[PDB]
Structure formats: C-alpha cells, structure tokens
Structure 1
Amino acid sequence: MKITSSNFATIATSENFAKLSVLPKNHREPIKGLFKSAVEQFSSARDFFKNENYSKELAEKFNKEAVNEAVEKLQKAIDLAEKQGIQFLEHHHHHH
C-alpha cells in the first residue's frame, strides 16, 4: 500500500503492527523498529506548534518534513513486510 500523510495514522495501527509477529526474529525486529520509529516521529511532528519559541512558519515546515520522513520509514517497513507475504489491513471508513 501507498503511505501518505493523510492515511498514515489509519494504517500504522497495533493490528498491522501485530501482523509482523510471524516473521523470523532476523526479519521481524528491524521491521518492527522502522514501524515504531515512524510512529514516534509522526506523533511528534506537530510539537513545535506548542513551542512558544518557534514561529508558525518553522513549526509548519518542520511538521511537514518530520511527517514526510515518518511516511518514508513506514513505507519502507510495509514494503519489506509485503515481500515476505504479509498483507496489512486497509482502513475501511464504514467500520469506524
């Protein structure tokens, strides 16, 4: 699947994370690492908005670049995982 800034949060779920548990430790730990790293970086990308010493311009720029790096990392983990036959869950709007 294609990770974007819009759909990140709806794909990087504990469910999709739990699917990684079938890979051998050799392949599983680095993928779990990229996944949890992207998620930590994504969920922190807006924190400069609340930092009073940062301008709105810089906080918006940083937010944008942190998200794009987290998206890149999640794409890397998903792509590594799909080559091993893992199929992640899409977001089905009518289920929420």
Structure 2
Amino acid sequence: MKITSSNFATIATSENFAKPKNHREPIKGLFKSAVEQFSSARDFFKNENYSKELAEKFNKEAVNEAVEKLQKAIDLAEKQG
C-alpha cells in the first residue's frame, strides 16, 4: 500500500492501528509518531509567526516524514502479515 499526503488520513486509521512484540511495539511507535508529526505539520498554517511560504515548505517536508514513516511502518507490518 503506497502512502501519500492525500491518503494518509485514510490509511493511518484507528481501524488499521488496532490490526509479535519485537514487531508490534516499534511499528506502533512508528505509526503513532507519523500521526503526531502529521497533525503538528497541519498546525504550521495556524502559526502567525510563519510566512505563507515557510509554513507551506515546513508542512510539505514534515508531512513527507510522517508519510515515509507510515510507509515504512506499513511495509514492515506487511512483511509480517
């Protein structure tokens, strides 16, 4: 399953999150950390100390990190089923 900024909110779901410890706990933390970073990225547009250009640049770059993380977490869960 590919992961983009646009499908992130429909793959990084509560249903998918609930779906072995040495794979459980890292992948969980990864999935979650992607959730917290994605949400803080969206809040850059609320920061009135950021220019429009800086907030867009930071948003895209942080969102990518949460996307690449979720891509990695899904890929690892899929190698383990």
State the identity %. Answer: 100
Higher helix share: 2
> Matched residue of 1:44: which SS?
helix
- What is aligned with 2:66? 70
> Size of the alignment, in residue pairs?
81
Note the aligned Cα RMSD (angstroms): 0.7
Q: Which has the larger radius of gyration?
A: 1
Shift of 1:46: 2.0
Which string of whole-angstrom CA distances, capped at 9 and with x for unpartnered residues, describes residues 21-42 of structure 1?
xxx1121000000000001111
Runs of 4+ in 1 over 2 A off after TM superposition: none
Q: When the two structures are superposed, what TM-score results if normalisation uses the length of structure 1?
A: 0.81
Judge conservation of contact 1:46–1:59 (CA < 8 Å) in 2.
no
* Structure 1: stretches of 5+ with no match in the other structure: 86-96
Matches of 2:8 and 2:77, distance apart in 1? 16
